[PDB]
């Protein structure tokens, strides 16, 4: 199998700046008819892969003039003269000269944007859930940047690691921010043996952590 190696693994670039992705094959991708079958795909978040370039440097229909492909033999490069928000996603290198067809590992393009503080909201368990014998406390941290963030849960002031489920969305193409959901799940019995529930967020945009909480007294 021909091995495709893409560099770098990730690329954080600001809008308007250039970006370059490299791809190397262990064997020459030159075919017996003189053509080199090397394509480039782009898989935007939540979408199927889409081919941008084929035969090394030919642009597929609809693909902006900003993209340019070059290379020969075993070394190929994809260049974007000016990055736009819609370019974010995962770029793949793929060869069709040797059997079986193989793809490179992928290069994730992230839009380097200005720092943005998260908007935190906390939610107590719904009455409907409490009836089932369970209790989930939810905390949303929306539209922030960079992606790095630390969320801590405190029940009656004590930190809780067990039973916490965290999930991040991919980078939003409209504002280039990320959002995060943190859910703390407890049994109805444990939820009722405590009073204060706190969601604490540590992010580079604030010197002190951002805190949201509620007590089972004011509902």
């Amino acid at each position: 199998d021909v091995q495709m190696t893409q560099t770098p693994l990730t690329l954080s670039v600001t809008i308007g700046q250039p970006a370059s992705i490299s791809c190397e094959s262990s064997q020459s991708l030159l075919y017996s008819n003189g053509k080199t079958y090397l394509n480039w795909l782009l898989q935007r978040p939540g979408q199927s892969p889409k081919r941008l370039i084929y035969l090394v440097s030919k642009l597929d229909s609809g693909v902006p003039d900003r993209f340019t492909g070059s290379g020969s033999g075993t070394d190929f490069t994809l260049r974007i003269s000016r990055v736009e928000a819609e370019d974010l996603g995962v770029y793949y290198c793929v060869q069709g000269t040797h059997f079986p067809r193989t793809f490179g590992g992928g290069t994730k393009l992230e839009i380097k944007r200005a720092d943005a503080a998260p908007t935190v909201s906390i939610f107590p368990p719904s009455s409907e859930q409490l009836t089932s014998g369970g209790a989930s406390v939810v905390c949303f941290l929306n539209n922030f940047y960079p992606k790095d963030i630390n969320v801590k849960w405190k029940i009656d002031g004590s930190e809780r690691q067990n039973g916490v489920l965290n999930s991040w969305t991919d980078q939003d193409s409209k504002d280039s921010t990320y959002s995060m959901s943190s859910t703390l799940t407890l049994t109805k019995d444990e939820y009722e043996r405590h009073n204060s529930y706190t969601c604490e967020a540590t992010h580079k945009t604030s010197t002190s952590p951002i805190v949201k909480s509620f007590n089972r007294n004011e509902c």
Partner: protein, 220 residues
């Protein structure tokens, strides 16, 4: 234009056979090109499985060949994928695609998720998320829906039947104990809610479940 659409079971028991269908509209599969099956594993890894050309000849990835088969139905304009003795390692998103490497013709399907597990299909429980110790004195109000305890993926979440689309954040599901938990949030100005109604609509095809949950202010 040309359109490829995958269809098939979303859940398959281990050791059993997986069967998927790719329905092609807008172009005949006997005219030209190779019609492929490609799968994507969690983690972004892509793997070409095989193809059947317009002439009916097939080609399979050596790593699968012993248990893979691709056939077609020229009267319905469809080609199929059959993967035998599937294990948990075959869990992935399956795509059908058509291209030739030297022409402008390239089309990919939407992809379909296939989970291999012994776990049973379970409908989700939908809980409304409304503000707690507050009446929302700010300008914006964030609401949400918690979709808990379902299997397998995926579920679909819309707000107010799709009319409410801006300010929405639906988070990727997290697995725990053979069950998934997903959440979604929507932010609206203090003007609407609680005045105007805000409902989240969740659908779980695997269990043919469909539930609309209205978000109402808490009393307590």
């Amino acid at each position: 234009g040309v359109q490829l659409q995958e269809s098939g079971p979303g859940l398959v028991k281990p050791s059993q056979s997986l069967s998927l269908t790719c329905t092609v509209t807008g172009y005949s599969i006997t005219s030209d090109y190779a019609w492929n099956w490609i799968r994507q594993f969690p983690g972004n890894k892509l793997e070409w499985m095989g193809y059947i050309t317009y002439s009916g000849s097939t080609g399979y990835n050596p790593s699968l060949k012993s248990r893979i088969s691709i056939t077609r139905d020229t009267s319905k304009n469809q080609f199929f994928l059959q993967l035998n003795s599937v294990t948990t390692e075959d869990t992935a998103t399956y795509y059908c695609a058509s291209y030739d490497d030297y022409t402008w013709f390239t089309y990919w399907g939407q992809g379909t998720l296939v989970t291999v597990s012994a776990a049973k299909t379970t409908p989700p429980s939908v809980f409304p998320l409304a503000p707690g110790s507050a009446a929302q004195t700010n300008s914006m109000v964030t609401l949400g829906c918690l979709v808990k305890g379902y299997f397998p993926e995926p579920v679909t979440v819309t707000w107010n039947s799709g009319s409410l689309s801006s300010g929405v954040h639906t988070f990727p599901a997290v697995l725990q104990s053979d069950l998934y938990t997903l959440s979604s949030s929507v932010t609206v100005p203090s003007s609407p809610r609680p005045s105007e109604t805000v409902t989240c609509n969740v659908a779980h095809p695997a269990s043919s479940t469909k539930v609309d949950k209205k978000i109402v202010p808490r009393d307590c």
